[PDB]
Amino acid sequence: KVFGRCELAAAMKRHGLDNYRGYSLGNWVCAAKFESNFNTQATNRNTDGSTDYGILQINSRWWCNDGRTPGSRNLCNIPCSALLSSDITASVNCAKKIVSDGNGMNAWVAWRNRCKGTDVQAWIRGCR
Ligand SMILES: [Cl-]
Ligand SMILES: [Cl-]
Ligand code: NA
């Protein structure tokens, strides 16, 4: 599923991401824009052989199982395919664990390089 911007904002807010760990909703929408272009089916291979999955590009090296990242962890206890569903519950629950682990949203490289320090409220402007 390719979410609309305001559609994703509403889903993220309903699942409790707005101000989670102090990160306002626009931070999460901006991160999703540049991680996946709002596409739940997005996948990208990393240099180390792990893969990033879903709207927030969660990495099989630590967070989910895809059966092809030898030596990785599965800290969210889910198959990586669950992060590609049109229903974003699994991705949000896993993102909550990631952002709680010490480095905040710096865990998302695209957030650090393209969202951090910018006017992230722009990403929820106009939405109901
Ligand atoms: Cl915001
Ligand atoms: Cl933080
Ligand atoms: Na894994």
User: What's the 26 CA to ligand 3 centre distance in angstroms?
Assistant: 28
Name the structure determination technique: X-ray
Listing DSSP states for 7-71 in one string gives HHHHHHHHTT-TTBTTB-HHHHHHHHHHHHTTBTT-EEE-TTS-EEETTTTEETTTT-B-S-STT
Is there a binding annotation on residue 101?
A: yes
Sign for the CA dihedral angle at 16, 22, 23, 26 comes to positive
Distinct helix (H) and strand (E) counts, the chain? 4, 3
Tell me the two tokens of residue 28: 């999460």
List the domains of the chain with CATH numbers.
Answer: 1-128 (1.10.530.10)
Ligand nearest to the CA of 9: 1
Query: Active-site residue 52, yes or no?
Result: yes
Tell me the two tokens of residue 56: 């927030």
Rounded distance between C-alpha atoms, residue 127 and residue 6, angstroms? 5
Please name the amino acid found at residue 77.
N
Alpha carbon of 119 to those of 6, 76, 123: distances in Å? 16, 30, 8
Q: Are strands 58-59 and 51-53 parallel, antiparallel or unpaired?
A: antiparallel
Rounded distance between C-alpha atoms, residue 88 and residue 9, angstroms? 11
Query: Active-site residue 7, yes or no?
Result: no
Burial-class residue 113 by CB neighbours within 10 Å (0-12, 13-18, 19+). Answer: exposed
Tell me the two tokens of residue 45: 């291979």
Are the C-beta atoms of 124 and 29 separated by less than 8 Å? yes
Closest CA to 58 of 92, 26, 28: 92
User: What's the 125 CA to ligand 2 centre distance in angstroms?
Assistant: 23
Ligand nearest to the CA of 19: 1
